[PDB]
Ligand binder design. Sequence first.
Ligand SMILES: O=C(O)[C@H]1O[C@@H](O)[C@H](O)[C@@H](O)[C@@H]1O
Length: 304
Amino acid sequence: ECEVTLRSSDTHPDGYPTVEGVKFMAERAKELSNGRICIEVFPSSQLGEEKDTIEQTQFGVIDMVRASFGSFNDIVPEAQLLSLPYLFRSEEHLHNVMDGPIGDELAKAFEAKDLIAVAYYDGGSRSFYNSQKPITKVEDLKGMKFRVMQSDVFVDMMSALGANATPMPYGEVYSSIQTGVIDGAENNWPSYDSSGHFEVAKYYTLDQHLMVPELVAISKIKWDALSPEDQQVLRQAAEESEPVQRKLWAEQEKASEEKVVASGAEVVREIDKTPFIEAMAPVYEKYVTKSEYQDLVKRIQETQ
Ligand SMILES: O=C(O)[C@H]1O[C@@H](O)[C@H](O)[C@@H](O)[C@@H]1O
């Protein structure tokens, strides 16, 4: 048994939808391989913060990782491109993009950087939360200090809004907010909840400026050393976990919103997003640098 073992990393805790997703993938891969293939999940950043685990996965030290496109920065340039603000209209839109040929194009981009993309997971939309004041309009962000994920595109996004970005690993955000070093950060409801940030940043504004895709990626080095039979099992188990993870995600979006609101989170709803969207013009100008990227963005916006 467990002749083929794979260590899989996630920054999130046990019980979180992405972790439950890979745990389901692991149960299925074990069943389908008659006990041969054994995926072990290491949650809560046990093996390191997310960007660091991505690099260790590329080197084959970690076998598999569940990660946000936003943690890649320049490592996979099209991953950064798909982290542009207000690129996707909805979770349905994003599903149709990632499920179609654009998803295959991105898979090729990951493979060129020694990562085999076997599933795309849902991460919903990200919105601003802070400890200082309600954000009711773009102008309220002026001069404020917000953590972002470690990609240049998010630093530029904050500058476009007249604020100051500070990239840092997810695990350090809570203390930085708590001690007042930064004013806030931005994320989806389940992160805002499970991270504890709602305890130290009670103001949340549903500006929904990002929908950053996520993936399960296997080390290409480890993958290439597997038999075709074992590769087939992994891909099957990964694809099976996708609809499952999507449903777990939808349920947790609801539960976490309810939870944090029950705890006193002060939420601003119905914000006019138009000025937020307009402000992103320079960001698109800076990152949409080609034909290859221009047409990509175009085909995304054209996807129903
Ligand atoms: O802000 C972050 O770093 C985290 O945001 C969450 O939404 C992602 O699911 C996670 O992969 C990122 O590490």
